[PDB]
Design a protein around this nucleic acid. Structure first.
Ligand SMILES: [Mg+2]
Length: 246
RNA sequence: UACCCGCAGAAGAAGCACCGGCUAACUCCGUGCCAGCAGCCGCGGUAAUACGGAGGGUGCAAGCGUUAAUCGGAAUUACUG
RNA sequence: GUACGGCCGCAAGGUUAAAACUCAAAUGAAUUGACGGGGGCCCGCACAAGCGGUGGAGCAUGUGGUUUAAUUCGAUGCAACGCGAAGAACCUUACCUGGUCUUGACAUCCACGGAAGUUUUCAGAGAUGAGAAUGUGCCUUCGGGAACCGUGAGACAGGUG
RNA sequence: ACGACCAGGGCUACACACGUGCUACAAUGGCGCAUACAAAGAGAAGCGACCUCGCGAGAGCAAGCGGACCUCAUAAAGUGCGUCGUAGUCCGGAUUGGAGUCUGCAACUCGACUCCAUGAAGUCGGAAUCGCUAGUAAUCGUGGAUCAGAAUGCCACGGUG
RNA sequence: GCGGGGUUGAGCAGCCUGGUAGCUCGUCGGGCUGAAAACCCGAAGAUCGUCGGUUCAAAUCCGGCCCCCGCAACCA
RNA sequence: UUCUUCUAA
C-alpha cells in the first residue's frame, strides 16, 4: 500500500574495502564478505565478484561484487555505512582490545539503458596490461572503476562501466535525496553513507545496530547468514518512517 | 512616614549545588571508550560509586552554582625568605 | 640558544636574545629487579663425541585450510595437534534435515481421576494412536488415593547457551 | 524454546598444507621347514579347553577354572636346515575386483577380519631437524584398559642388545 | 614520412639465417624465527605484438596491420 | 667475518 522506492526491486552492485585499524579491518573486510556470501546463497541470490583485492595478509584491501536475484537492492540499501569490529588480535598476548571498522557501498542494479546521460566524452577509458585490463573514468564525477580480471577486453569493459554507472546512480540519487528535505522523513538513518551503523563485539558475540540501536548476541548465527533477523526490523522501522509521515 | 492597633488562616512565602579521590556526603537502574563527564588525578573499552535517571544523602540558603578577575597558599624572583 | 633586530666577521658565522604555541610533566641521584652482541663462576644429550630417526614414499591418526544442510565444541609458540575422546555403524551427539513436544525428559510441591500392573490389534520412519483383557499388592469413620498411572493448576524446570 | 523426544544424516567430506605415527625401499634379507625361549596380566554368560568341522576367518560340543589349580597360553626376535642371488625382485605391499566370516536392531554412507585375484610408490629421502649417556638406544614379541564390534594409539610386560 | 622493436608474471636473453623458450626477481611451497624479515631449500609458469604467407615446419623467413619508439618534416 | 624489526585497555 505504501509508495515504495522503485529501485528496490533492482539488484545490488556491491563495494567493500578495508578500513581503519590495520589488518584487523582488512580481515574484517574479508570477514563480512563471507556473511553476504552466506546471505545471498540463503536468499537464493547469485554472488558475482566483479573484482577483488586482498591486502595479501589474509584480508581484502577491497572487493567489488554484484549480487542479483529478487529485490536485492531493496534488502541491502540500508547497509551502506561504517561498521565496526571489536575483538582481540592474535599477535596480542595480553588481551588489549583493538578496534577496527569497514566501509560499505550498496548501489541499485542500474543498466546503461537506465543511464541515458552517459557520455563517452564524459568518460575516460584506459586499456592496459590482446590487452584485457579496462579502466573507465567518468570525467564530471571523477568516478574511476577498473576491471582487469577477465581474460578478454570486452568482458572487462562492461564490468567497469556497470559499477561506474551505478556509482553515477549512487552519486546522483544521493545528491537527489540529500537535496530533498521532506523526503527524508521516510528514511531510516541519516541518509549519508558514513554512519557507524553496526558494531561487532566478537568476545561477547555482539551485533549492535546504531540506527535503531538494536543489540543482538547472535553474531555466530548472523555471520553465517542469519541477517534477515536484522534487515527486516530495519525495514519495519524504515516503513514506520514511511507510514508515520503519511 | 516611622510607629501603634485589631483583622483572615498555617495561612500568602525554598531552593540551588554536590556525594571515585582530593572533599563533607550513595545506592539502584538505564548506559556501554557510545552517549558523555572533567578543577586535578582521571572515568565510560557491559557489572560506571566518576555517564543519564531514580531514590537517598551532603552542603549552603533566598539564594545557589558557573565564569571572569586580584592576592593568597608560592620560601614559585626567596628583604625577611 | 631558535626567530626578528642590533652588533661583529672576508665568509663560515659569532654575539645579544624572544614570543606565539604545546605539554603536565621534564630532570636529579639512589633502590629492587629484569636485561646485556658486559665480566667471573657453575650446570644441562646444550654443544662436542656417538647411535638411530624425521623431513622423500605409501597408509593410519590429528589439526589447519577447503567443502558441507551439518562437517558439534574446545585445545593452537615451547607448554595445540594418536589432545579432550581409555576406542562417532545407530547410540554416542552436544551438529544437520525433517517429524514432533510444552510444569515440560526431569526434580519436588499441588490437587484430581484410575490400585499398580498385566497381555495384546492396528496406524506410524519412529517419536505415538485408539483398541484390548485386567488388579485390588496398600490401606482405610476408604476423595478410591498413596505406591503408581493419567489429568489439571501453577510453583518452576531445563540449557553441552 | 538456547528446553524435551524420534528417524535419517553428519561428526569419516577433500584442490591442499602440516604434525605425529605405522610399513617399506631388502641378502644381517625374503621364504619354507624344524626348533628354543619369556614376563606381566586377563577371566564366570567370562576365559572356554578337548575334539569336531571349516584352507582360514570361524562353526559346534562344551570340559575346566572366580582361578600359584583351568583357560587366555603356541611368546617373537632367535636357533638349525633348505631356498631365493642384487632384481621394483620370492623386496615390498598400496590399490581394486571377487568371495566370505563375526559383531550387533542394523556393517550403503561408515566396521573389523578371512580367502582368492590384483601387485602402486618405494632401491635410504633437500634446506633442515629429532631422540638417546646402558640394560639405554636400537630391535623383537606379549598384555592391558577402553570395548557389542572395532587400534599402526595409549598404558604396561618381557626378549635381544 | 622514415627506421626500430614488441619473448613465462615482470624486465629481458636467445632471436642465426627454420628444426633450440633461457635469465633474473617475483610467485608458489617448505625450512629457519616466539613473530616478521633476511637467508636457505624446492617448485611452477611463453601461442615470442597482430593478420597472414613462405615453408616439411615460423618466435625465427617474408608480407600487411597494432603498438610505440627514434628520426625528419627542409630552401625563399 | 656477519647479524634488522615487534601497531593499538
Ligand atoms: Mg612441520
Amino acid at each position: 500500500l505504501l509508495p515504495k522506492d522503485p529501485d528496490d526491486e533492482r539488484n545490488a552492485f556491491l563495494e567493500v574495502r578495508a578500513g581503519t585499524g590495520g589488518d584487523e579491518a582488512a580481515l574484517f573486510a574479508g570477514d563480512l564478505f563471507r556473511m553476504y556470501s552466506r546471505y545471498a546463497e540463503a536468499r537464493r541470490w547469485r554472488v558475482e565478484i566483479m573484482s577483488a583485492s586482498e591486502g595479501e595478509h589474509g584480508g581484502y584491501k577491497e572487493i567489488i561484487a554484484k549480487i542479483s536475484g529478487d529485490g536485492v537492492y531493496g534488502r541491502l540499501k540500508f547497509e551502506s555505512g561504517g561498521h565496526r569490529v571489536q575483538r582481540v588480535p592474535a599477535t596480542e598476548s595480553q588481551g588489549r582490545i583493538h578496534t577496527s571498522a569497514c566501509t560499505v557501498a550498496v548501489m541499485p542494479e542500474l543498466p546503461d539503458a537506465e543511464l541515458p546521460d552517459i557520455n563517452p566524452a564524459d568518460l575516460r577509458i584506459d586499456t592496459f596490461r590482446t590487452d584485457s585490463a579496462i579502466r573507465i573514468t567518468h570525467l564530471p564525477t571523477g568516478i574511476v572503476v577498473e576491471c582487469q580480471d577477465e581474460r578478454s577486453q570486452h568482458k572487462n569493459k562492461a564490468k567497469a562501466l556497470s559499477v561506474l554507472g551505478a556509482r553515477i546512480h549512487a552519486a546522483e540519487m544521493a545528491k537527489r535525496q540529500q537535496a530533498e528535505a521532506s523526503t527524508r522523513r521516510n528514511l531510516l538513518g541519516s541518509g549519508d553513507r558514513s554512519d557507524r551503523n553496526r558494531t561487532y563485539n566478537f568476545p561477547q558475540g555482539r551485533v549492535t545496530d546504531h540506527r535503531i540501536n538494536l543489540t543482538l548476541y547472535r553474531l555466530d548465527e548472523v555471520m553465517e547468514g542469519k541477517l534477515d533477523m536484522l534487515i527486516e526490523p530495519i525495514i519495519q522501522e524504515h516503513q514506520a518512517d514511511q507510514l508515520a509521515a503519511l
